């Protein structure tokens, strides 16, 4: 059920000047990755992992869009609840992809970047979309996030970032949980977006200025809500809810990261089909239990470099988005 994809960052002018060697080889037909472990371009031991899809570095923004984000789109516009985690050791592009960044000196804006990443395209189709249509809607968006089990709100522009939130189970709906404190901005059109996000950037900073490797060592839940009063060529007026969450795990390179930690056996607990799976044991678990084998449509984006020197991680992480794959939701 959960769909798993690697995405392949390319050579830094780090390793292009030292005119060094890769050891990934992303293939898109055959939709797989391998490793090469032992060495030689010549003769070498390799180690090869196949998954839903397979991006090289040759990609665009544009290509990871219309690939696996447009779909999770139309379903969460059905009132479908979908989950996106990007997935990797720091430094391969995990946010790169979730968030993109800006094409320099200006030459475009933010909504013709090739190099805006998701959240970014996603905003500005969400709108693209329901505005066109004799739709009626209204979309709201959170950032939570994690530090050291501390929750933290990125856009709330009324209290600074030492304020973090607190975790009570909802007792309405069993495995749910209430965000005391959470801020849910509301996005009347596609003009808000940009300084939204202006926003959090500025926010985030002064949480990496406040606690240590922040950027490396925390987990950014983006969410954007669409509350949908559709009314087709009939006079029938849906009501539909979706919820489309967007991930940006800590580095999954090895204090402690007790989430990053609850995850891996989270997984590892669903897909052994352990009767008992420990979601209650961090907060990003509970705090997104659903997606984990729940009714949620959740899909992994693992990120790796083709540098000899992440080798270890990189297999690390091809073999955990690997076995990401037997887990069933919906
Ligand atoms: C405000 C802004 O310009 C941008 N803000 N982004 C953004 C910000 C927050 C809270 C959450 C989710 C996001 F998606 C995305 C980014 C790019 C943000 C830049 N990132 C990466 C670059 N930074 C680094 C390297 O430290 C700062 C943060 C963007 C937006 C539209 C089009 C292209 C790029
Ligand atoms: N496909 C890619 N194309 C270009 N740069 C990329 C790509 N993937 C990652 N990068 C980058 O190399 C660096 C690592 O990116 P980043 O997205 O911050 O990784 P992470 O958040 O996993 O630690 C950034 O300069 C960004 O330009
Ligand atoms: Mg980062």
Known sequence: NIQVVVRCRPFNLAERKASAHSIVECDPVRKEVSVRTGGLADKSSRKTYTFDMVFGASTKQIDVYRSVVCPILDEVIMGYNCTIFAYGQTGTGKTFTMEGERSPNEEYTWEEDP?????PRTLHQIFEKLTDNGTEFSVKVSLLEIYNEELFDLLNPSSDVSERLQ???????????????????????????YQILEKGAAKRTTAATLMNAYSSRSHSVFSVTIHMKETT?????????????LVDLAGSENNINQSLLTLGRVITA??????????????????????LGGRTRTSIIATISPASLNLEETLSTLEYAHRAKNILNK
């Open 167 to 193: 975790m009570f189970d909802d007792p309405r709906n069993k495995r749910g949980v209430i965000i005391k404190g959470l801020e849910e901005i509301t996005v009347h059109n596609k003009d808000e977006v």
């Open 115 to 119: 190099l805006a990443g998701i959240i």
């Open 233 to 245: 060529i009939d006079g029938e007026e849906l009501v539909k809810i979706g919820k489309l969450n």
């Open 270 to 291: 669903l897909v052994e089909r352990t009767p008992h799976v420990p979601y209650r044991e961090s907060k990003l678990t509970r705090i997104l239990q659903d997606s």
